[PDB]
Amino acid sequence: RMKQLEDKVAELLSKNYHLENEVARLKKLVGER
Amino acid sequence: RMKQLEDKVAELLSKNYHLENEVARLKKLVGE
């Protein structure tokens, strides 16, 4: 279960980084928009 | 160490939800 928890943290950091990248992308669209 | 990893998941999933909600709002502003 420890390795499961570890993998879930890896997974969530990656998802959050993706979402941060999206927020940045959309903020960029807002500017030019 | 179990507790540490559990609390990290709680923390990151909360953050995830905040970020998802911000993306949702921005997408509606821009038209996605």
Tell me, letter by letter, the H, E, C secondary structure of B1-32. Answer: CHHHHHHHHHHHHHHHHHHHHHHHHHHHHHCC
Q: Give A26: exposed, middle or buried? Use CB within 10 Å, 0-12, 13-18, 19+.
A: buried
Resolution for this experimental structure (Å): 1.8
Distance (Å, whole) CA B16 – CA A17: 9
Residue A27 contacts residue B31 (beta carbons within 8 Å) = no
Q: Which domain holds residue A7?
A: 1-33
Of A16, A19, A11, A15, the closest CA to residue B25 belongs to A19
What count of other Cβ atoms lies within 10 Å of the Cβ of residue A22?
A: 17
Nearest to A10 by CA among B1, B5, B17, B4: B5
Structure tokens at A11: 């997974």
Question: Which residues, 6+ apart, have CB-to-CB distance to B19 below 8 Å?
Answer: A16, A19, A20, A23
What method was applied to determine this entry? X-ray
Q: How many domains does chain A have?
A: 1
Do B6 and A1 make contact, defined as CB atoms within 8 angstroms?
no
Cβ distance of B13 and A9 shorter than 8 Å: no
At CB < 8 Å, which residues of chain A contact B?
Answer: 1-2, 5-6, 8-9, 12-13, 15-16, 19-20, 22-23, 26-27, 29-30, 33
Task: Find out whether B32 and A28 touch, Cβ atoms under 8 Å.
Answer: no
